[PDB]
Design a protein around this ligand. Structure first.
Ligand SMILES: O=C(C[C@@H](Cc1ccc(-c2ccc3c(c2)OCO3)cc1)C(=O)N[C@H]1c2ccccc2C[C@H]1O)NO
Ligand SMILES: [Ca+2]
Ligand SMILES: [Ca+2]
Ligand SMILES: [Zn+2]
Ligand SMILES: [Zn+2]
Length: 161
């Protein structure tokens, strides 16, 4: 017999992701770099490892979309909601969706994809929003040599050690 675990977390440390499609605002290479750097934020403070698949079903499926894109969290055009992600689990669990009505960059202009991805992948791993205004998991985007704040390190390590 088996029981569902209490806290939402991945039961395995070696996770896969797939970049399903790409925003027009950055080159493939830049998009790949941003998401890879964003996984590294979490892998540098946990035993978690992330491997990219080029097709098939991955633990974390990453896609860009606009307005209605196949869930109950439709996007809203430029600005407003930037992205959202589902907490760990089967099926849609772990998936991260980014609004392609935003202007995505590797810079201080528009919305920085790496920074937003780093936040969203926190959700993909089981972190909810923080009340700490300085935290990566605070629910409001602010742009910033990025260092993961203590609140997020504590949060993610309470899940994965
Ligand atoms: O919660 C969400 C949506 C959220 C998405 C979102 C993306 C990134 C960050 C963030 C926070 C701190 C950081 C950082 C990024 O990089 C360094 O330090 C916070 C929230 C959003 O789109 N936030 C919007 C929001 C929410 C409330 C009020 C205003 C706004 C404008 C946007 O910031 N999905 O998971
Ligand atoms: Ca939007
Ligand atoms: Ca999935
Ligand atoms: Zn979505
Ligand atoms: Zn969030």
């Amino acid at each position: 017999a088996n029981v569902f675990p209490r806290t939402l977390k991945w039961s395995k440390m070696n996770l896969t992701y797939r970049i399903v499609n790409y925003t027009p605002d950055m080159t493939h290479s830049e998009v790949e770099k941003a998401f890879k750097k964003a996984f590294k934020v979490w892998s540098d403070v946990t035993p978690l490892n992330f491997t990219r698949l080029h097709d098939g079903i991955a633990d974390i499926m990453i896609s860009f979309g606009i307005k209605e894109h196949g869930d109950f969290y439709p996007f809203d055009g430029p600005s407003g909601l930037l992205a959202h992600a589902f907490p760990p689990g089967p099926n849609y669990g772990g998936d991260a969706h980014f609004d392609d009505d935003e202007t995505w960059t590797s810079s201080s202009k528009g919305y920085n994809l790496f920074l937003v991805a780093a936040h969203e992948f926190g959700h993909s791993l089981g972190l909810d929003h923080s009340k700490d205004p300085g935290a990566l998991m605070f629910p409001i985007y602010t742009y910033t040599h990025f260092m993961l704040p203590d609140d997020d390190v504590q949060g993610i390590q309470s899940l994965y050690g």
